[PDB]
């Protein structure tokens, strides 16, 4: 039987995730759970819409339950509440709350019996794999990571005269090329990343002002440039949402031999990317649960065969 | 305290493991066992150095047994000779036996409850790794792998059996264009020769005829008569200053599309100096994951794809998510 798939939240990472079950046939999407009034909800599937209120009546309908909410409002009361009715997946990703966010989750997980998997997704997630990976086989050696170019996500339209915009951010091409070398650089915020905001003006609102108002945002970290332009350039243009990066560790064997591990992404969708690793999780903490095993999980505790639905003995014949 | 580590074999990987082992203060190492009589090796940290027929007798002094032998002879016997006694941890790389080698070994480690970690390293090993996560990722996607720069070893030495040659290194390298044909998303089919090509440096012997040597390297059967071949001619000196090194790497790229169509693309990639030295410390690495494995009652061989990262690393699991997550 399909590894039955509940979504909670239809944003962009809830539609992302809908489109992710698509693409893996042993699951299968059966209901999504919103705030708002299901009937003002059209799923691109159809399956049914149900509050959020109703999940806990579910239980014995859904295998796991992907969370899709952002880790600002949404994720810091669903995690904890979900986990208690639910294996769940999320991709939480505020730094500082990581650990309290761990371990209210676990405590949840802990005392019902499921399987919850935190922070999910790029970055958190196969970046934080990809540092971890780097210094443990290079214990002797530098990580960096970089984030671009890509879309990255408001305060920017509080600013008076800004009727929309949308802001990039950028890795230095001369820092990525000397972690490359291996030169093991000392390198600031400001020689990593560069920013690039497009801004459709208010009528009558003063360029150079508005301006100077983003560069000095409490962006002030960083090379900032604006660029002026008009609604219709930025529906057509910077609808997209693509990102990207890498993490690079460079390091040393103890008789001096430099060794560069690189792990990259170049994405044409953030949102896409993220739900389809999400899905992949989710399989893990129905194969951890059907296995008995309980409480909060990171990337860092879940093995890689757990991820695909093919056999172990498959997998060590075909990619090994 | 110390994880205690032995290594079966001294050659390059052997050396390796030594090696790393001063880059992991966790661990020590115990001793190395060789087929060798055991005075006649020098091992550089000076720790003893034992004949294998002993090593049984160490069982207690060990906790996971790093095996440096190669594959086609070494590890056939000695990983289910080891894990008979030992944790252990092998860099297993004949990927049509790894099924066959896979199953003894996890005969053997069964019954002693010991744990066993087959087929360590960078490919395979690392690029597995990468290879699986491209394709549950992306589930609809092509998946390349590509090998080098770095030394091909049966190659090397089936040029030193032409006639004429004195000595010789071989190369494989991925051909940029094809590299950055996956790169753009294309999803190409790709020929043997158009992914990557052979570059040979060759010392001659006094009155070898070079177009000879050139024409039978190039058309070697099962080796080089598959791909472009270069081969450049050099004196003794320039093999030594260039080319006594033991560089590697390669790519793992999976290019993928989500459901409405948006192009994803994951890479992974190496660039090594010395390939044993990178392959001999993630056997260190895994050596970690074998002993916390061993002390929570696991037992039976285990790939890569049965060891989550987090055990890799000497750091708690929660100074973990703290630092890197």
Redesign the interface.
Not at 257 to 269: A, G, M, T
């Given at each position: 039987s399909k590894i039955r798939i509940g979504i909670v939240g239809y944003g962009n990472l809830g539609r992302?995730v809908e489109?992710?079950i698509?693409?893996?046939p042993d699951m299968e999407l059966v209901a999504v759970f919103t705030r708002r009034d299901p009937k003002t909800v059209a799923v691109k599937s159809n399956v049914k819409v149900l509050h959020v209120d109703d999940a806990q009546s579910y239980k014995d309908e859904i295998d796991v339950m992907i969370l899709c909410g952002g880790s600002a409002t949404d994720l810091p009361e669903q995690g904890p509440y979900f986990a208690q009715y639910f294996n769940t997946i999320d991709s939480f990703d505020t730094?500082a709350r990581?650990?309290d966010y761990?371990d209210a989750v676990n405590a949840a997980a802990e005392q019902s019996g499921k399987v919850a998997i935190i922070?999910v997704g790029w970055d958190?997630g196969?970046f934080?794999?990809n540092?971890?990976?780097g210094?443990?086989?290079?214990?002797?050696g530098n990580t960096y990571t970089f984030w671009g170019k890509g879309v990255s996500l408001g305060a920017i339209r509080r600013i008076q005269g800004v009727k929309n915009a949308v802001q990039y951010i950028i890795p230095i091409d001369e820092a990525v090329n000397r972690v490359?070398s291996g030169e093991n650089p000392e390198l600031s915020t400001r020689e990593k990343h560069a920013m690039e905001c497009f801004v459709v003006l208010e009528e009558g609102a003063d360029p150079a002002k508005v301006e100077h108002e983003i560069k000095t945002m409490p962006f002030d970290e960083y090379d900032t440039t604006v660029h002026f332009i008009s609604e219709e350039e930025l529906k057509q243009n910077h609808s997209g949402m693509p990102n990207g990066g890498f993490v690079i560790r460079s390091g040393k064997?103890?008789?001096g031999?430099?060794?560069?591990?690189?792990?990259?992404?170049?994405?044409?969708?953030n949102p896409?990317?993220t739900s389809?690793?999400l899905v992949?999780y989710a399989?893990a903490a129905y194969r951890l649960s059907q296995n008995g095993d309980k409480g909060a999980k990171?990337?860092?505790?879940?093995?890689?065969?757990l991820?695909?639905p093919k056999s172990?003995?498959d997998?060590?014949?075909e990619?090994?």
């Open positions: 992302g489109a992710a698509q693409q893996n730094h990581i650990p761990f922070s958190p196969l934080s794999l540092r971890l990976l210094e443990v086989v290079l214990p002797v490359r064997s103890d008789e031999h430099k060794q560069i591990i690189e792990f990259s992404l170049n994405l044409e969708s896409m990317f389809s690793a992949a399989r990171t990337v860092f505790d879940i093995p890689f065969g991820l695909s172990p003995e997998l060590r014949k990619l090994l």
